[PDB]
């Protein structure tokens, strides 16, 4: 039992940049086609591929940190959908 935490004095309580939509993890950079529409509220982390005609809507999180995530041609992921990948 601890019941003790140490607040950080350099922690940021308001990021003027907001949340970055494309979050590369090391060498994994999400690839978004120029034809595809990704809402500004969407977060794409890790290796996530969005193809032509695809669309990702508000509040959706596509975390491809563990394994690959792919969204096909003219396939859409609608509002506030969490798409995640596991190791196996």
């Amino acid at each position: 039992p601890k019941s003790q935490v140490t607040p950080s004095p350099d922690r940021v309580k308001w990021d003027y940049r907001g949340q970055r939509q494309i979050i590369p993890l090391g060498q994994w950079l999400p690839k978004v086609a120029v034809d595809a529409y990704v809402a500004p509220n969407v977060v794409l982390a890790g290796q996530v591929t969005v193809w032509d005609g695809s669309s990702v809507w508000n509040g959706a999180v596509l975390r491809g940190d563990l394994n690959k995530i792919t969204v096909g041609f003219c396939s859409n992921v609608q509002e506030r959908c969490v798409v995640h990948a596991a190791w196996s």
Binding site: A33, V34, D35, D52
Partner: protein, 75 residues
């Protein structure tokens, strides 16, 4: 009528929009290069007509020379 300037401008705008479409981009992506394409198309069409006239004149002169050379066979 249909002048070389307008057909050239339409071809330039069309090739700009065609290039934009071929890259999955919106048609009117960069308007400034659309204007540049219209200007270049007009210039190229006018130059093509100006070159065609001179080319036909040169061909007429050269065929006159060839016919004159052939006509000497009968002497």
């Amino acid at each position: 009528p249909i002048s070389a300037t307008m057909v050239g401008a339409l071809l330039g705008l069309g090739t700009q929009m065609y290039s934009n479409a071929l890259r999955k981009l919106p048609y009117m992506r960069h308007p400034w290069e659309h204007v540049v394409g219209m200007g270049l198309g007009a210039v190229f069409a006018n130059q093509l007509v100006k070159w065609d006239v001179k080319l036909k004149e040169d061909l007429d002169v050269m065929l006159a020379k060839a016919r004159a050379a052939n006509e000497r066979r009968y002497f």
